[PDB]
Amino acid sequence: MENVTVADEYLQNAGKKEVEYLLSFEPDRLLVEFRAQAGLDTKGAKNYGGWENGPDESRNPDGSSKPGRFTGHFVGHWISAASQAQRSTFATADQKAQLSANLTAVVKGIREAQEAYAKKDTANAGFFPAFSASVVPNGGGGLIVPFYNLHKVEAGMVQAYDYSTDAETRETAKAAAVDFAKWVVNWKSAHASTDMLRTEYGGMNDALYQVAEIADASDKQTVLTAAHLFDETALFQKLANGQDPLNGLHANTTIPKLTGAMQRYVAYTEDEDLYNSLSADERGKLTSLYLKAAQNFFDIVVKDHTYVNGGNSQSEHFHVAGELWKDATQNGDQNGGYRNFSTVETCNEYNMLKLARILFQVTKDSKYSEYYEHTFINAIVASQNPETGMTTYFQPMKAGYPKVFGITGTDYDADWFGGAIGEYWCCQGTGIENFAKLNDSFYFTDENNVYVNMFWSSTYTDTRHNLTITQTANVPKTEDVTFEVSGTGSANLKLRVPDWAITNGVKLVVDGTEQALTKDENGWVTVAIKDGAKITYTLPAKLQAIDAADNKDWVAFQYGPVVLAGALTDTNYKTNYSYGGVKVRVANYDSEANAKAAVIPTSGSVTDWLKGIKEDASEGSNLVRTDDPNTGNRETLSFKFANVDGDAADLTLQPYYSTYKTTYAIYWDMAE
Amino acid sequence: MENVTVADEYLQNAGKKEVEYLLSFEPDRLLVEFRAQAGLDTKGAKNYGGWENGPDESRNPDGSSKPGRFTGHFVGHWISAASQAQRSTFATADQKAQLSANLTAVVKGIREAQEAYAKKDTANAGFFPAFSASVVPNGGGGLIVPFYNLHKVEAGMVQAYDYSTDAETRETAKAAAVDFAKWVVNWKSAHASTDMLRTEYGGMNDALYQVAEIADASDKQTVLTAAHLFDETALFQKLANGQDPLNGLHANTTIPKLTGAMQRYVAYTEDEDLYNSLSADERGKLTSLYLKAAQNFFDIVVKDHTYVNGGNSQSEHFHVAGELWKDATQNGDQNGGYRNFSTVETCNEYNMLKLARILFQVTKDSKYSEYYEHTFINAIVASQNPETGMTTYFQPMKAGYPKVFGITGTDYDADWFGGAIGEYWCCQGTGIENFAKLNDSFYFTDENNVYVNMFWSSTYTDTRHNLTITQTANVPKTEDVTFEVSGTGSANLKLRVPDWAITNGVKLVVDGTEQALTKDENGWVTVAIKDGAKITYTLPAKLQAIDAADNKDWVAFQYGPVVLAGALTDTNYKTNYSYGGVKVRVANYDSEANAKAAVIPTSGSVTDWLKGIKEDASEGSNLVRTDDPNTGNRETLSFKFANVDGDAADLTLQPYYSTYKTTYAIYWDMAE
Ligand SMILES: [Zn+2]
Ligand SMILES: [Zn+2]
């Protein structure tokens, strides 16, 4: 197998915690609501509760009856994450065997429930019985976003087909997935005049195109039909025209529709039979509608809707182009609900990363890699508590809030959470995938080329080209990246010249000779590689200030690919949150912390003070690097301000991604 | 502390004898050679002699100069066994305190000698001075197998660290062990071109990996370097590839090497820092080379090189696959040397049990537990004289020999052995450990599970799950095994359905209700337990004939897990042996006795007569159980042949393990 064993200690920890969390779920509990709805033996089990509550107070840990719930959505993500983990390299052999056993139990359990349900309600044969079919597609009786929830199960099944080491389990997942697609078409046929897209359906089009990719030849058209039902072509047409229609749209709702557009492109273009199936017009639309919508959506989001950490949205929605500071600061700091703190739902970056990834695969444009790296570090790796492994919902952008993480709802992390019932936010479900597949986008490989998407210490056993590539990277703690190659084959390594590097300082040495940084048409430097190749790639980290389009005086600092955060005040994870939405924990504001985020130039204006920040972070800069490059790991990166008045002078700045024990400032308030 | 108290009277006797033996050794006499070599005061002491003689005629009780010897090997075993005993439950509180004091004296004494030696020969600092460093590694001046001898001391130091109740002792042992490991590296650095693996080195890799496990972080890599130098990867590679290269290999030399391969596996997989230290290639080879070599070695030894009692080897060697009858019978019955009687060295089964144990711990496969039970009974328990507590070297498989045991070489058993000077064979060293750690493999515990490895009357205080488990077992004298559970926690009990039970008769009753014999993927039946649980497991014993692959007419009989032996003639322990190898006592043939082991069917052919053997040993069988199930202990099991001519008609068959006063037949010669 191709594999990427990850050497980085921080990432190894992050991935290990996820494997441990994943192992803590009991199949019988994950399976309860499917079995109940299918009229099968629940074996006395409770569901995991929270978003995975069902209608029934007996099966719900919290004893609640018909609560607002999203039944099946986290089980789906668990199938995805368990599939990913028992094929990645974070889990030991023993962990993988147990995780793969539990995956198998769940995949077969759902299939068994699907088959029993098909007998009980033949009209809806193929439905995944996570909840009542009667409430499709707008929800009912407390069940929210039915197709969103089902989407996770369908996508999960595809991951199980792709990655289960057990052949039976793969074939069962495929059958389950194809039969669900068939249900979608049947259902729609019997509800011809019902609209399916009004209510959030997640990436259902994406998932069904994936099923079409794995389906037997004779099923492909049926599944493509199901998939195309979930293409929101009105939205795509607007995006493909270069319009920005995002103001007021639910952000995480929208983003996966464009990944689905991209999956339609890939499904048809990778299989001549499917491509030949289309009208020459629809063949054209793959590019003019579907790919263009995704390209434009991505560009519009990054330019006009993205915060310094790669993330987007506030109160779960896109707002006016360019109005980032307003959304993050003019919406209140009261306890509870969704307010200033509700910036940058984390699911959104899972989905943005998948969109960048598939756009990279199709186009090879380096800008998607630049984004991927940035958002991976600054939103995804940043989402996780390194001690508990749990992950964030929102990522507050205004200074003075703590990071708030979910809880397990299992016996995992009992030392932290006791016997608390889990909540299972959407964001925890995309969360478990983030860490199960943490190493899935280090490299991309086609016929001749190995693209280095990110700079991390790892070993890639490139089975396509018969090469082992070992990268040593610690950017931006130290500046030199090395690659050593062994094997029998040959390839071109492709390197990005990061925009976060000091361009003049960038140096490429290949087998002891310097090489020019000549970019291909997609932005990549090419290095021929074979057994014995040795590369030193020097990437001096640039320190930069980054403001908001709508406020020059709201400023974050980034060193290399790492956004910095100031540690403001202590926080207590037991009490530092309230609730909003459906059982979503939200950060409590620390006004005393916020005030410390005043940056007040001693001498000169704000403008002058910003000009005095040196790219090299050296003495004389108004923000100086204080850590010793040759002592401590990457997380010991440290900066301090200079020529500032107030508490700011005393603050240390450190990586945002590793900041969790304290309230923090990522954006600072420049004070003239 | 977890503990297992053994109620079985035979095993209680066996363990108590060992404790008594261990206590008869004086630390000053164990330390003599280490002190002498280090230039320390020997206090006028003589060493114990035999294999524990040194070069010097004045310290050897026998007055020999530079005899064939193995100085340190038995001291090391004694350190192991004293450590095991003073942490087991066979010894009284007084016996534990005394033995612990004596362990302390010996560990500090060796550490003292190690530190003194390091000043006198700074090149070889860390060497354990059992003998001259200059004869490392091939031996010289009468000192044989240097690294094998030092292996025992190293492994000893680990046991002391594991089990000593004195913290100074634990720390002294760890220091000694780690410094020995550093010495291995230094010595090899200074003798880079010397091959270290050609002469038997015992399980040096195993012990050094164990030392890597207990070592301070900053020392682990140095110790792992030492351990891996004793990894005989050429042998492992052949076994991993599924070849049988065993013919002509010394068996006890070979077996512990594979235990070492497993220790490599465990050392790295249980410590994330060590695991993460490995290249991706070597991470894979943990499974593809080391685990697999061990797995295949086990399978090949058991299928093609093992006698009916679980044991292997003739003349200390493996021979041709399947030629067990030939090795055991076509090599002479003359007195002295190593001939037919030299089958089944006893060390070998100590080592096989340890390999099986660690394979079980990693894989949980029930076949390792099946083998463990079989060989623990039929080769290990069978190796001891229940009156003297002394143990066997060889175990003759050809009929007509007596069991020959060692002597104490101490004041222990002086009524039997007088003032005779000890021999301290290998098999006596493993033997003292066998009986010291006699309760160490009744159960295996992991997070949710308690595996019943063997069926013995005991009480297990399971401190991991807060349960006390009282097992009552007498198999195969009576068929019912009962478990009673008390406490406050919960676990799953895991039970084997033994292949030696009559399948159809196996019955499981849990808290009054029969439960099915559903096996997990590893072969185990699962029983939820907690306070007040009561289990009756009915295991009706199967009687069976077991031949040799190379001779259908060379046949042994087994009832449940107990191999039977016929009592043939009286034997006199004072005169019934000669010598072979280095001071090894070997059994003298009784040709009369052998002739009684002729089995001639009255009516029918051999084939017919073997078919007439009933699984239940009932009337009508050609071999019938004659003892009353409800009268006597397990050792009163008795059987007689039916429908046979000659003296065989008159013989009684009883358990092999408790046969010691007579010559015996285990394999019978079927005659048409
Ligand atoms: Zn979310
Ligand atoms: Zn031996």
Numbering used by the authors:
A (entry chain A), B (entry chain E): 379 to 1050
Authors' account:
In the present study, we characterized a GH146 β-l-arabinofuranosidase, Bll3HypBA1 (BLLJ_1848), which was found to constitute a gene cluster with AGP-degrading enzymes. Bll3HypBA1 also exhibited < 1% degradative activity for Araf-β-pNP, Araf-β-OMe, Araf-β-Hyp glycosides, and β-AOSs containing Araf-β1,2-linkage compared with Araf-β1,3-ArafGal2 containing Araf-β1,3-linkage. The crystal structure of GH146 Bll3HypBA1 consists of three domains: catalytic (α/α)6 barrel (aa: 379–820), β-sandwich 1 (aa: 821–920), and β-sandwich 2 (aa: 921–1051). The Zn atom of Bll3HypBA1 is coordinated by Cys3-Glu residues, and GH127 and GH146 enzymes share this structural characteristic.
The crystal structure of NΔ379CΔ933 was determined at a resolution of 1.70 Å. The NΔ379CΔ933 structure contained two molecules per asymmetric unit, and residues from M379 to E1050 were modeled for both chains (A and B). The Zn-coordination site structure of NΔ379CΔ933 was also almost identical to that of NΔ379CΔ761, but no Tris molecule was identified in the active site. The Zn atom is coordinated by E723, C725, C804, and C805 in Bll3HypBA1. Therefore, these residues may determine the β-linkage specificity of Bll3HypBA1. In contrast, Bll3HypBA1 can act independently on rice AGP. This is consistent with the structural characteristics of Bll3HypBA1, which contains no large structural element covering the active site.
